[PDB]
Structure 1
Amino acid sequence: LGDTSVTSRTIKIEQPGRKEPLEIKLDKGDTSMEAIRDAINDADSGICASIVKVKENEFQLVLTANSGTDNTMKITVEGDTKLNDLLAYDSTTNTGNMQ
């Protein structure tokens, strides 16, 4: 999913609830969809990544927060560009690359 040139990247998730933003670190080879799912699911900080097979040979990545209006996510990716183009939301202005 992401560029293979950068060996280290970080996913930064910020919510009104948590005070310290959550950083999940992906090293080399962790740019696959399964690897991102496993990293976010192993952090065990509230966000729960899933995968959906809409139909044969097409998949999506779904990130779900907890209940409430204080758990709106503001996702960012630092160290990578293509992944940042893929995973980047901003719930303050409701504008991002993820529906």
Structure 2
Amino acid sequence: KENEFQLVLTANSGTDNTMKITVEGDTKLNDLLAYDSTTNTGNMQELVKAEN
């Protein structure tokens, strides 16, 4: 809504294309962009789940 913004990362279609994100060199960006899809935990949240 007005005066609020969000960042969305979308992979390709499929369950082989599940992102695992790690930021290297910076600690704040890693605090904001960090997801481990293998363990399904991270700083980002998953809106849409991957399917075949």
TM bucket (normalised to shorter chain) is: 0.7 to 0.9
Distance 2:16 2:28 in 1: 29
1:80 Cα deviation from its structure 2 partner: 0.3
Q: Alignment length, in residue pairs?
A: 45
1:64 Cα deviation from its structure 2 partner: 0.1
Larger radius of gyration: 1
- Aligned ranges 1:44-59 → 2 under 5 Å: 55-59=1-5
Note the residue ranges of structure 2 that are not aligned, 5 or more in a row: 46-52
The structure carrying a bigger helix percent of its residues is 1
1:63 is paired with a residue of what secondary structure? coil
Tell me the TM-score normalized by structure 2.
Answer: 0.85
Q: Which has the higher contact order (CA 8 A, sep 6+)?
A: 2
Superposed CA RMSD in Å reads 0.3
1:92 Cα deviation from its structure 2 partner: 0.2
Tell me the TM-score normalized by structure 1.
Answer: 0.45
2:40 is paired with a residue of what secondary structure? coil
1:83 is paired with a residue of what secondary structure? helix
Q: 2:10 aligns with which of 59, 64, 69?
A: 64
Q: 1:74 aligns with which of 20, 24, 28?
A: 20
Superimposed CA distance per residue, residues 23-80 of structure 1 (whole angstroms, 9 cap, x where no aligned partner): xxxxxxxxxxxxxxxxxxxxxxxxxxxxxxxx11110000000000000000000000
1:85 is paired with a residue of what secondary structure? helix
The structure carrying a bigger strand percent of its residues is 1
